[PDB]
């Protein structure tokens, strides 16, 4: 007889219910320890709520400092969706360069989808802490009170956590930056371009400080995706209706050709969209023989399911490097942090009353 | 037969 | 022979009814029912719960079921209390029936209905996160207050 006290799989490591405090977060100087928040996390390891929100309001003073556009150089590593996948994330790392000597854009999209959504904003906000000139992080249409609540990581920081962690959260993701300007040479966004925003200074007069409405400029950077038919100008209308979304639009080759051209700018640099291969390239432009746009997608495996690689775009000499990389082992939870006992429960009753029935007939 | 993950 | 005593909601004519079926599945008229003679009904024998019911309703611990215990067992799963079909429920996974879920019996409970569906590593961790989210007094296991408290918003446990 098997023990019904003690652990059946005993060498699978027990996450510790040790909360790190502030002491053990922050140093003498205010700088986080990114390696022992890391080895933490990793352990599914919890923080002291104090510690929590403290490391998600000054990341969000940060942010708050920064313009709508930011103005990045190279070299730098451009990343694309994570949507929780902490344990991808610290291959991320590994395979970009090390934050203390790289620097790095995330294209947003942080939480949701995933099940380690507020570890990636912790140790994300805490690398933008400790590096607050090399690290840099874009907004995302999942960095948003709507998105949160109807996926998981509104239920996620009720579980771990509590909902004052979601609420620091959401006010947060209100301060991140929606686009960025790298090496004046590439327009850095989430989802695209807009109908109303023609130039870059049309992204510096947006109010960002806000939830993002379901339509505008602001909603196009977050939400729009290029046209299915990208580069096979079949539709002559630059922005169409986004019936894979439900709002913001598609946006055509010569729409994005007609704002490189106007604004002197080389390429777009985006993410929102899922690729086999960790990323895409669509149609170069005529006069520079390099693609008008990359979707960049930095979750392998995504949603466990898509067997997809991931990449991230190591810009540097001169050369724009796509580093792909496959997905890594993580701890498991059942689909939106269900319980073993809601879980089964349903099924319990359902198989002891099929037994009884049949036994008394 | 079996409890099948959601 | 002396009268038999039981705790039931059964009315006489009930308890008659059922003791006719109680006679048909004890095929040796041995007077209690073994495993094999409750797997001998097709219905029950890919059915991953039968030894825990059969566990439950034993209460002397013997290994088979006598009439008593067939009474009783079949009343906590029929003009019952929302407490009883929740106790019962918590019985489920109460392997060694001392009141408290521990990790061990959860883990084996489990993996008795989720068979191969899951790997062990995977089924050890969310069995530890669910009693590390469940547990408010910091014992390690869960007690029915705890159990409840987690189920008890959940509402389909009766028979005729
Ligand atoms: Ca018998
Ligand atoms: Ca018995
Ligand atoms: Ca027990
Ligand atoms: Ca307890």
């Known amino acids: 007889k098997l023990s019904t006290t003690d652990r059946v799989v005993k060498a699978v490591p027990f996450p510790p219910s040790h909360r790190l405090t502030a002491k053990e977060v922050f140093d003498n100087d205010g700088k986080p320890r990114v390696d022992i928040l890391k080895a933490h996390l990793m352990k599914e390891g919890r923080l002291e709520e104090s510690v929590a929100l403290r490391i998600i309001t000054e990341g969000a003073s940060i942010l708050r400092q920064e313009k709508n556009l930011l103005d990045i150089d190279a070299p730098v590593t451009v990343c694309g969706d994570i949507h929780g996948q902490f344990f991808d994330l610290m291959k991320l790392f590994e395979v970009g360069g090390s934050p203390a000597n790289t620097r790095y854009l995330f294209l947003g999209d942080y939480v949701d989808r995933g099940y380690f959504s507020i570890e990636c904003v912790l140790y994300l906000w805490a690398l933008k802490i400790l590096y607050p000139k090399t690290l840099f992080l874009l907004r995302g249409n999942h960095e948003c009170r709507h998105l949160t609540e109807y996926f998981t990581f509104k239920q996620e920081c009720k579980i771990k956590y509590s909902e004052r962690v979601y609420d620091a959260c959401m006010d947060a993701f209100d301060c991140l930056p929606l686009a960025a300007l790298m090496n004046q040479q590439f327009l850095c966004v989430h989802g695209g371009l807009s109908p109303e925003i023609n130039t870059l200074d049309d992204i510096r007069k947006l109010d960002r400080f806000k939830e993002p409405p379901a339509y505008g400029p602001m909603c196009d950077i977050l939400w729009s995706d290029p046209l299915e038919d990208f580069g096979n100008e079949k539709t002559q209308e630059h922005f169409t209706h986004n019936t894979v979304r439900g709002c913001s639009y598609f946006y055509s080759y010569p729409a994005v050709c007609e704002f490189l051209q106007h604004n002197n700018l080389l390429s777009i640099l985006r993410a929102h969209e899922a690729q086999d291969a960790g990323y895409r390239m669509y149609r170069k432009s005529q006069t520079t023989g390099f693609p008008s746009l990359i979707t960049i997608f930095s979750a392998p495996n995504y949603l466990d399911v898509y067997n997809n690689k991931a990449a991230v775009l190591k810009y540097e000499n001169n050369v724009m490097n796509i580093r792909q990389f496959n997905c890594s082992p993580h701890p498991y939870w059942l689909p939106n942090f269900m319980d073993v006992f809601t879980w089964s429960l349903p099924f319990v009753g359902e198989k002891v009353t099929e037994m009884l029935v049949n036994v008394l007939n | ?6 | 022979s002396y009268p038999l005593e039981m705790c039931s909601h059964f009315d006489a004519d009930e308890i008659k009814r059922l003791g006719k079926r109680f006679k048909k599945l004890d095929l040796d008229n041995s007077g209690s029912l073994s495993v094999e003679e409750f797997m001998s009904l097709p219905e029950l024998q890919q059915n991953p719960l039968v030894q825990r019911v059969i566990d439950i309703f034993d209460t002397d611990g013997n290994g088979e079921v006598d009439f008593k215990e067939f009474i009783e067992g079949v009343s906590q799963f029929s003009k019952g209390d929302k407490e009883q079909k929740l106790r019962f429920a918590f019985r489920i996974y109460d392997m060694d029936k001392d009141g408290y879920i521990s990790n061990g019996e959860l883990f084996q409970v489990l993996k008795m209905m989720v068979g191969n569906n899951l790997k062990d590593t995977q089924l050890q961790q969310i069995v530890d996160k669910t009693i590390i989210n469940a547990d408010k007094d910091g014992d390690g296991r869960i007690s029915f207050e705890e159990f409840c408290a987690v189920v008890g918003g959940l509402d389909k446990m009766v028979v005729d």
């Open chain 2, 1 to 6: 037969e079996d409890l099948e993950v959601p």
